[PDB]
Amino acid sequence: ERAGPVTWVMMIACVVVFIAMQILGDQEVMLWLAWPFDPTLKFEFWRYFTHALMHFSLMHILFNLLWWWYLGGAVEKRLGSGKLIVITLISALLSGYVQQKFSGPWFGGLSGVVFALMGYVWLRGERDPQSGIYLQRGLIIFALIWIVAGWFDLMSMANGAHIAGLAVGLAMAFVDSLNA
């Protein structure tokens, strides 16, 4: 069944970029897709989003894609493709902006988008149950353990990206839930 088209196009794009990273090397791809490290690069607009496509091991990509396929598939199934796209664009842009302030431009991965979708599905399912999405208590647990694990580096997480992504998804869900 579904996954919808935006869930799968994102999965294929991450897989494609990851294969390219295996062949060319991480750093070679990073030089072109990472958030700009130099203000002269600031009009290379793809870079504000393409950092989300990069993963640094199979575990990195599998674990993000799992959560993406589960949470993104639910948003796209119940609320449609345009909604998933907007959540993704805004959370990638804002979690990358915050991550870059916390630790500079050398980061990547979908987990900023993942924490926005965790925030969104949980708050939306809580305040607006008729949306048909929700986040189970078990998963809420793991999310909270995952954030704090990053605080203590149990590893080297994009901690700014996590909290900012989370905030973004909570705020969009709050706004979407007011509305009906």
Side-chain angles (χ1 to χ4, degrees):
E1 71 167 320
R2 81 105 84 205
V6 168
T7 309
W8 276 92
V9 165
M10 181 68 28
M11 292 166 83
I12 296 326
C14 290
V15 164
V16 162
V17 162
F18 183 76
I19 294 173
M21 297 176 72
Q22 308 324 293
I23 300 172
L24 316 168
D26 288 357
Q27 314 196 110
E28 198 28 48
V29 177
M30 276 202 289
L31 281 166
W32 288 102
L33 300 191
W35 191 283
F37 75 91
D38 177 350
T40 306
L41 302 174
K42 84 190 173 295
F43 302 110
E44 297 181 354
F45 296 115
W46 63 90
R47 294 178 170 279
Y48 306 113
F49 307 95
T50 54
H51 56 89
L53 303 182
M54 293 188 288
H55 299 88
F56 304 107
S57 64
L58 242 119
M59 189 56 31
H60 195 199
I61 191 171
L62 296 193
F63 187 68
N64 284 348
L65 287 188
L66 167 73
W67 280 108
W68 168 263
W69 169 85
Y70 183 62
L71 300 162
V75 162
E76 179 163 33
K77 172 186 199 88
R78 285 290 106 238
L79 299 187
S81 293
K83 180 64 60 184
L84 185 55
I85 286 178
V86 181
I87 293 171
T88 301
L89 293 179
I90 295 180
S91 64
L93 174 56
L94 301 191
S95 63
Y97 176 82
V98 174
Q99 183 51 41
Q100 173 269 146
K101 300 304 203 177
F102 278 27
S103 297
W106 309 112
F107 62 88
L110 200 56
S111 87
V113 172
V114 163
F115 270 95
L117 288 162
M118 269 175 305
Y120 187 95
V121 167
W122 178 68
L123 187 168
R124 182 80 192 263
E126 212 54 46
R127 296 175 34 86
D128 176 32
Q130 290 164 296
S131 63
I133 66 185
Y134 83 120
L135 189 74
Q136 320 185 51
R137 244 215 150 198
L139 304 183
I140 297 171
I141 285 156
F142 189 64
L144 289 177
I145 308 309
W146 184 359
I147 308 163
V148 313
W151 294 347
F152 301 91
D153 282 348
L154 275 66
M155 304 183 93
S156 175
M157 304 192 194
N159 293 320
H162 298 172
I163 197 70
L166 187 64
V168 163
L170 296 169
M172 297 180 66
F174 180 66
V175 176
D176 287 354
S177 278
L178 281 161
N179 292 153

